Amino acid sequence: TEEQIAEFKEAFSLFDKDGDGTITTKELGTVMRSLGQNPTEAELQDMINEVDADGNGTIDFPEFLTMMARKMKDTDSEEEIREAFRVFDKDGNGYISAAELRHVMTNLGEKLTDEEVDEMIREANIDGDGQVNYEEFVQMMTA
Ligand SMILES: [Ca+2]
Ligand SMILES: [Ca+2]
Ligand SMILES: [Ca+2]
Ligand SMILES: [Ca+2]
């Protein structure tokens, strides 16, 4: 963890421009900008409120660190799921068709008829294209 807080410390300093130990809507603002995004003060204020646990109006290390921890898990999630999607989507076309789910389902040890695969697509197909896209996929995986 020692070398972990250090890493986190490094990330915190980019934001803490004047090094007083807190991040302000203005400091958050200059970083967003240096990144090519010019948020309004109102949008900046919402970004701070979300992380500000004690309501003093700024974010300190412990608050950042704790925001950061939780969110690093969820990006390690979206990434596992973004993976499975890619193995399913044999023709990297953005969509999982019946032919594709059937092929991979057979490699998982289940030989399904076209009818059973059809039923799988249906169940998860929202926009009704008869295909499963990333969006439909995650809702199917997670929820
Ligand atoms: Ca500061
Ligand atoms: Ca605070
Ligand atoms: Ca495909
Ligand atoms: Ca669809």
Side-chain angles (χ1 to χ4, degrees):
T1 23
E2 228 204 299
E3 148 185 55
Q4 268 183 309
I5 125 222
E7 285 163 279
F8 282 127
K9 213 151 271 185
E10 251 154 85
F12 185 86
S13 328
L14 171 70
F15 294 94
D16 190 8
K17 292 324 217 222
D18 68 356
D20 78 326
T22 74
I23 313 158
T24 253
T25 60
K26 329 89 193 77
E27 285 177 328
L28 175 63
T30 124
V31 173
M32 297 311 230
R33 254 115 71 190
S34 86
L35 289 190
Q37 190 164 187
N38 291 69
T40 68
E41 180 86 30
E43 287 171 315
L44 258 21
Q45 193 69 217
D46 288 320
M47 295 180 227
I48 266 69
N49 287 176
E50 208 208 315
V51 327
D52 188 24
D54 63 355
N56 55 1
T58 66
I59 135 99
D60 70 8
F61 195 58
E63 279 163 352
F64 179 84
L65 187 310
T66 80
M67 161 249 160
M68 238 43 166
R70 264 201 280 302
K71 172 193 268 299
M72 293 258 67
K73 320 263 279 300
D74 306 11
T75 166
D76 278 330
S77 277
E78 182 69 1
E79 277 196 313
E80 259 143 293
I81 295 165
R82 271 181 148 82
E83 261 179 17
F85 190 81
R86 236 169 245 148
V87 351
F88 276 94
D89 184 26
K90 178 140 189 135
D91 73 3
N93 87 330
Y95 305 112
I96 294 170
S97 66
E100 294 177 326
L101 177 68
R102 195 171 106 248
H103 190 61
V104 6
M105 222 53 199
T106 128
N107 296 138
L108 268 41
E110 292 283 332
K111 324 168 60 189
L112 262 35
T113 75
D114 177 47
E115 164 164 306
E116 293 180 311
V117 158
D118 264 323
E119 190 177 332
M120 291 177 91
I121 298 284
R122 285 197 278 119
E123 175 156 345
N125 183 32
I126 301 178
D127 75 7
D129 64 350
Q131 252 148 11
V132 41
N133 72 188
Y134 185 61
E135 182 153 354
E136 302 162 329
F137 186 86
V138 346
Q139 342 218 8
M140 204 36 59
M141 243 77 231
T142 80

